[PDB]
Symmetry: C2
Subunit: 137 residues, 2 copies
């Protein structure tokens, strides 16, 4: 039986800017680094950055909607979004759904998000206003 997400691994084209992004800009804890990768944590999340010559710096119009959302409190959301904006981090989408969300790109074009709100909160909102074709289990 699967018990949760064990780790998220992102392929990166250049290790130093990716470590700077996740550790320094985004505030994650750097636990180890080696010639071809790094391990960081963000709360319970184990993040691995893996240096990969196959990684393309990918414009957001050229990748699909796969994305990785990090939790932040409502109280901290606006100042963190402003930090990303000050650093010139690109936005790939505007929020149109329940709960605050800020949609931003990493140095290689990985699609990231800051989101406020749980699955339970989303399901409660959906029960009141179901999406087209929505069924609950």
């Amino acid at each position: 039986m699967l018990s949760g997400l064990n780790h998220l691994t992102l392929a990166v084209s250049q290790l130093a800017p990716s470590v700077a992004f996740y550790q320094q800009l985004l505030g994650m804890t750097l636990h180890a680094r080696w010639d071809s990768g790094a391990y960081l944590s963000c709360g319970d999340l184990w993040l691995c950055l893996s240096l990969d010559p196959q990684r393309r710096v990918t414009p957001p119009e050229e990748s699909d909607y796969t994305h990785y959302a990090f939790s932040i409190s409502e109280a901290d959301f606006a100042s963190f979004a402003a930090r990303l904006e000050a650093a010139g981090v690109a936005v790939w989408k505007l929020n149109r759904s329940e709960g605050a969300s800020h949609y931003f790109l990493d140095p290689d074009g990985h699609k990231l998000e800051l989101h406020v709100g749980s699955l339970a909160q989303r399901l409660a909102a959906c029960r009141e206003q179901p999406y087209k074709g929505m069924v609950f289990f």
Copy 2:
């Protein structure tokens, strides 16, 4: 401050086969589905499957090393991996370069992994058998 992964969203090309893969084959909990997506959980993980016409079925030699690992216990690991193999689930990696792991593909070629062990356990193993150039903080 960021506090962990709020959710993982995977773009999928065909919603029903992807829901079946995560729910039926991998045993995740299906909470809701609608015409364009589904919400599942795997322990604390919120997984969203999002129907995306841009998603392509991607062979593993065409994608980078970005991947998503799910936790499984030492007692359950081998029989779950063997069940996926017997069900014909495609693979993408054989060499265990980061401990006890099984590497497999979802229907669209998303790179998945079963892994036994925490970040702390992997750091302890790496102290004895470090990756080239490894430094611990």
